[PDB]
């Protein structure tokens, strides 16, 4: 492995036509410090090659805005986008659906051809009013544009100003048309900017909130399976006050209060570094990255976060560490022996391909391949250090590529998404879903690590894997 890896890469690319072989080659690399010298990323997908990527509407509606529980989010366009993305992402929340929370519902303008012809702007204002009579307890409205809204020249920003002023509601236009950008990534930036311009400033004057030196915000935790509740509880046991959760289980008022905090804790850099930079410029609030995947990364991140405060938070940090230490050591003692030595290939989106490596290593596994669907070069710079030498790195991996890499490398476990799952199960290779957590989790924090380890163990050592081959062959 090293020369066999760079070999493998050239055998696979042999199938493509010339133009795509020369692009795809730049998005596969073997690890050995500045990604701008190893692999290129955040570039359009080669047509017809079965990429895994989604669109900017997924990035804005599905990931950033949809989780915000007390707003109503309108999918503005034909009925497809809102339907495929209804309740497909497990951004969990406490609430009374249909009354004061609305995350798993599908509000939509259901565009017909008449609306393509005359425009959907008069439909939008009529739907804002129906939303108001039927869901009186909503705390604001988002309008997430689908592919056709831009292309036909509608103007949702004017509908928002006018209807927003008329009803004294926040209405946030979001121009997340699916054709914009190359991936979900631009959806993140369009959505962050929409929060900045339409929400985040709403309380710049207000000072009626009582601040403390220990107020923080969790930024980019979308509470998959409760991941962010498993994080908040540690932060508050450490002495801090999480004034806001962006956007897992998040309320619009929690977002309007983030400019009051003293420190912005950023879990998902890729999807939220935009707003965090902005809050540092305008409000003076610093931000740091953290990683609550596994006890080694979680311990290191608590101690780094407590170091920004005084002694008392630092004292409490050690008390949290020691409370949970026997718990994850009982987890390790039980599952590390059943998982040590097993090799993992990852393929996810923008953050987990690097952030979960520490939790596999804490069970004695080895991440021999990883890749991101839509990461940027700063994500790869951070990944180079987490990965070992001569491991395989792949950006916007095609379906053919992933299948062919797996055949040669033969990992013991693959971790990727739904579209990949049943592919490798057929081939005989244990799979765990690393977006939905395979309807399990949380995986964040100490309480999450017990579940991750039990999950990786139940799948990797399950009896079904010994039965793929009929005894008559």
């Amino acid at each position: 492995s090293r020369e066999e890896v760079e070999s493998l890469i050239q055998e696979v690319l042999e199938v493509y036509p010339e133009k795509a072989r020369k692009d795809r080659n730049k998005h596969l690399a073997v690890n050995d410090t500045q990604s701008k010298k190893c692999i290129i990323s955040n570039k359009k997908s080669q047509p017809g090659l079965m990429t895994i990527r989604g669109c900017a509407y997924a990035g804005s509606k599905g990931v950033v805005w949809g989780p915000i529980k007390d707003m109503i989010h309108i999918s503005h366009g034909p009925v497809g986008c809102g339907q495929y993305s209804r309740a497909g992402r497990r951004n969990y929340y406490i609430g009374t659906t249909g009354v004061n929370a609305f995350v798993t519902m599908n509000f939509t303008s259901d565009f017909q051809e008449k609306d393509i012809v005359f425009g959907g702007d008069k439909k939008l204002a009529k739907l804002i009013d129906e939303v108001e009579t039927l869901f009186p307890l909503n705390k604001g409205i988002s309008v997430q544009s689908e592919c056709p809204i831009g292309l036909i020249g509608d103007d949702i920003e004017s509908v928002s100003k006018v209807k927003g002023a008329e009803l004294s509601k926040t209405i946030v236009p979001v121009r997340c048309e699916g054709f914009r950008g190359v991936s979900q990534s631009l959806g993140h930036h369009i959505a962050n900017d929409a929060v900045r311009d339409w929400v985040l400033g709403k309380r710049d004057e207000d000072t009626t909130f009582a601040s403390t030196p220990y107020d923080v915000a969790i930024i980019g935790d979308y509470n998959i399976g409760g991941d962010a509740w498993s994080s908040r509880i540690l932060l508050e046991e450490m002495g801090l006050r999480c004034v806001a959760q962006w956007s897992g289980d998040g309320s619009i008022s929690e977002i309007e209060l983030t400019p009051k905090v003293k420190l912005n804790l950023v879990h998902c850099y890729r999807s939220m570094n935009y707003i965090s930079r902005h809050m540092e410029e305008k409000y003076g609030i610093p931000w740091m990255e953290y990683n609550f995947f596994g006890p080694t990364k979680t311990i290191e991140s608590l101690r780094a976060i407590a170091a920004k405060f005084d002694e008392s938070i630092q004292k409490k940090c050690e008390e949290v560490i020691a409370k949970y230490k026997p718990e994850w050591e009982a987890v390790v003692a039980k599952y590390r022996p059943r998982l040590e030595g097993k090799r993992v290939m990852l393929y996810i989106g923008g953050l987990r391909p690097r952030h979960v490596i520490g939790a596999y290593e804490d069970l004695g596994m080895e991440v021999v391949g990883t890749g991101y669907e839509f990461a940027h070069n700063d994500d790869y710079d951070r990944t180079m250090k987490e990965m070992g030498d001569s491991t395989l790195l792949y950006d916007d991996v095609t379906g053919y590529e992933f299948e062919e890499f797996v055949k040669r490398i033969k990992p013991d476990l693959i971790g990727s998404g739904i579209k990949e799952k049943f592919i490798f199960q057929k081939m005989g290779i244990p799979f765990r879903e690393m977006h939905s957590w395979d309807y399990s989790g949380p995986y964040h924090g100490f309480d999450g690590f017990a579940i991750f380890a039990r999950d990786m163990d139940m799948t990797l050592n399950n009896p079904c894997w010994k039965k793929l081959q009929a005894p008559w062959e």
Partner: protein
């Protein structure tokens, strides 16, 4: 916290005291929550007749739809052809969703590709995407066929699918003889089922329109069977099984049952089974063409009658007892083959099951939704069982269909408290099941939130969901069931009777309260 000998997932982990208090502090500190008495008040209002009036007055807002966009069906139609790749000209996000939506219903790989149109393609169209698309897909995934549909971006900017494909062949990106049937499938018209019809008619013409001089109706002694958008693998298998039992020669046009059911045996098979391009070229030589779901196969019908010159029979979907009968007798006439002893016995076994279970089925009231052929099948069979289909909602239904269903409803005593809703969604259905409560819903997974809301009002108001339809995401392997034929009827009957008995068991499990009626024999 966690005890390593009993790890808790999110349920019930977050019910531990420390988590419950944190969430209380989060809510009181920073969520500015509406008071709980105001929430209960608004919820009670949403279950009332007054709220239902406002609800049904909606014209611009849709809430919880019961349909998808056309290209989701174009994908499933093309998945039904041998070694063919579904290819969706437009933006790649749509394909990521089509794939996902089907992966979770079938729990199986679903292959589809996109040519990743973006901002720049909006200005000058997607011609270069298509040229490089077809060549890349063809070289990489090695199909015998590539079948082309469109996303809403492609439709709006006005790409010419015919011209771009031809140019891709003139410019030498794909061989000229390589088949690339295509269809326009605009999300802003009709629904996923329409995209099925449009794609089907696309592939029929591709293989047929220019070759008709040679064709002779009936010369191949077979009957064509066009199934439509179909998400139960047993529905393809029952049809094939009954035709073979009568010894009828048949071609099933669009057959995905192999590709949506490959074995787990060490190796990933991208393609499997399916209608050969050749059965498609020779389809005009069949005796006739039967459309199993006529109410979403209008475009296909006009073609098989207009070009193939078949006299397509006026048959309903073969669901339940009468429409299965009529389907077999129509097949018997067309083919010259008698209905065999084995099917006559299976009919009589279905009728026997109906006689054994009628007392638990009688008067049971149902709210139901789905695509139009499947929903009218359910209505028909429910009536045959003595059940009262009270609420019938078809989001993608039309006036002409609604008239047919209302005719069916009037020809039977059990349809008299029934109403058919077209163009209404699951938030309208929510109201109907509060104000005019049925005993069960029959529908797809999205109905679980309607069951949940009704329980919140009270256990006496709860309407339990019976999952039949598409999509089904929260139970495994129901995609393998059957709903057509006498077998499909036997399955639906068993599932309804036992939902009823299970519900009764639960209401009578209370010791010394309601268990006087917890009978061992039901």
């Amino acid at each position: 916290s966690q005890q390593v000998d009993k790890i808790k997932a999110s349920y019930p982990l977050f019910l531990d005291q420390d988590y419950k208090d944190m969430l209380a502090k989060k809510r009181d500190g920073f969520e500015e929550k509406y008071p709980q008495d105001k929430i209960d008040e608004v919820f009670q209002w949403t279950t009332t007749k007054e709220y239902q009036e406002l609800n049904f007055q909606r014209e611009a807002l849709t809430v919880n739809p019961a349909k998808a966009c056309q290209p989701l069906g174009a994908v499933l139609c093309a998945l039904g052809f041998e070694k063919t790749m579904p290819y969706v000209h437009g933006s790649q996000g749509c394909v990521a969703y089509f794939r996902s939506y089907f992966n979770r219903h079938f729990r199986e790989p679903v292959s589809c590709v996109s040519d990743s149109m973006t901002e720049d393609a909006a200005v000058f169209g997607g011609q270069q995407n298509m040229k490089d698309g077809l060549q890349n897909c063809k070289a990489t995934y090695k199909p015998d066929m590539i079948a082309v549909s469109t996303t809403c971006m492609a439709e709006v900017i006005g790409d010419d699918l015919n011209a771009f494909i031809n140019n891709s062949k003139k410019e030498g990106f794909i061989p000229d003889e390589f088949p690339v049937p295509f269809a326009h499938t605009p999300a802003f018209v009709g629904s996923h089922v329409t995209g099925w019809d449009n794609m089907f008619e696309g592939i029929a013409r591709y293989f047929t329109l220019k070759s008709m001089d040679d064709k002779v109706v009936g010369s191949n002694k077979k009957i064509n069977i066009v199934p439509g958008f179909e998400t139960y693998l047993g529905n393809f298998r029952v049809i094939k099984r009954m035709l073979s039992e009568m010894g009828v020669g048949y071609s099933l046009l669009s057959d995905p049952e192999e590709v949506l059911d490959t074995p787990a045996d060490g190796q990933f098979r991208m393609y499997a089974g399916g209608t050969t391009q050749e059965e498609m070229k020779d389809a005009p030589n069949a005796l006739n063409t039967v459309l199993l779901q006529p109410w979403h196969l209008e475009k296909t019908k006009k073609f098989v009658e207009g070009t193939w010159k078949h006299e397509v029979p006026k048959l309903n979907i073969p669901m339940g007892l009468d429409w299965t009968d009529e389907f077999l007798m129509k097949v018997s006439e067309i083919s010259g083959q008698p209905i065999p002893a084995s099917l006559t016995k299976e009919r009589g076994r279905l009728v026997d099951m109906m006689t054994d279970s009628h007392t638990w089925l009688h008067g049971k009231r149902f709210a139901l939704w789905g695509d139009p052929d499947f929903v009218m099948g359910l209505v028909k069979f429910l009536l045959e069982l003595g059940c009262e289909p009270v609420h019938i909602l078809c989001h993608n239904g039309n006036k002409r269909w609604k008239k047919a269903v209302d005719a069916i409803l009037a020809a039977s005593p059990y349809g008299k408290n029934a109403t058919v809703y077209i163009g209404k969604d699951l938030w309208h259905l929510r109201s109907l099941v509060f104000t005019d409560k049925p005993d069960f819903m029959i529908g797809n997974s999205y109905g679980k939130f309607i069951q949940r809301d009704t329980l919140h009002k009270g256990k006496e108001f709860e309407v339990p969901l019976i999952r039949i339809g598409f999509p089904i995401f929260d139970r495994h392997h129901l995609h393998r069931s059957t709903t057509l034929g006498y077998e499909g009827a036997m399955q639906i009957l068993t599932t309804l009777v036992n939902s009823i008995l299970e519900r009764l068991d639960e209401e009578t499990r209370g010791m010394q309260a309601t268990d006087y009626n917890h009978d061992l024999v039901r």
